[PDB]
Design a protein around this ligand. Structure first.
Ligand SMILES: COc1cc(S(C)(=O)=O)ccc1NCC#Cc1cc2c(NC3CCN(C)CC3)cccc2n1CC(F)(F)F
Ligand SMILES: [Zn+2]
Length: 197
């Protein structure tokens, strides 16, 4: 399949992502490593992702998420849920059972099967921050473990976040690596310790 770009692009509105500072306690359900540009999360749990701009884009702007394999030899393969999880009948009514990334808590979420590339994505409208807030937040859920055999199969993925106009034209792009695992805090600590060597 075709290769979606992963190149960081702030664009005219100064678009970029932000993450909470959740620490690495054993109980943490989602945690982000700036040093690794890597989000560690548990299966089907809330992953807050912040959206930052220097200036407000137009009404009708949307934000899309898509997963791609990070390694060169796998990037052309569609990232999808594994044979077990795509058959477990756990759709919320919007997400197709094959889709790895869901949006939590937004009834306006839309799911795309690309007719040409067969890649999956989920897109929502974006709005300015609530009163007293400086950014907006999307809550994502990842619906397979990184280790799921016949799906990601222990291969690392990136999530590409794109800011789009109402026609789908590119306004901005950012990305981060993702590991979906049972203990994100320990795994982040381990991978950051490995980095220190
Ligand atoms: C129904 O939706 C809309 C309605 C209107 S409106 C009521 O004027 O009719 C206008 C726009 C939209 N929607 C598109 C959007 C947006 C947006 C603005 C934004 C943001 N603003 C600050 C504002 C202050 N200055 C100094 C820095 C920038 C800070 C952080 C995130 C922000 N976002 C979301 C993002 F990042 F994804 F683009
Ligand atoms: Zn799975």
């Amino acid at each position: 399949s075709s290769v979606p770009s992963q190149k960081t692009y702030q664009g005219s509105y100064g678009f970029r992502l932000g993450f909470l500072h959740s620490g690495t306690a054993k109980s943490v359900t989602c945690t982000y490593s700036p040093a690794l540009n890597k989000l560690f999360c548990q299966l089907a749990k809330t992953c807050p992702v912040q959206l930052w701009v220097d200036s407000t884009p137009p009404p009708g702007t949307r934000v899309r998420a898509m997963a791609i394999y990070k390694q060169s030899q796998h990037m052309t393969e569609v990232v999808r849920r594994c044979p077990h999880h795509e058959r477990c009948s756990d759709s919320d009514g919007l997400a197709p059972p094959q889709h790895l990334i869901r949006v939590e808590g937004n009834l306006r979420a839309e799911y795309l099967d690309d007719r040409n590339t067969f890649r999956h994505s989920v897109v929502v409208p974006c709005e300015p921050p609530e009163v007293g807030s400086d950014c907006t937040t999307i809550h994502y859920n990842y619906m397979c473990y990184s280790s799921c055999m016949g799906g990601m199969n222990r291969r690392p993925i990136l999530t590409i976040i794109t800011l789009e106009d109402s026609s789908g034209n590119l306004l901005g792009r950012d990305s981060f690596e993702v590991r979906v695992c049972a203990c994100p805090g320990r795994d982040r600590r381990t991978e950051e310790e490995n980095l220190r060597k």
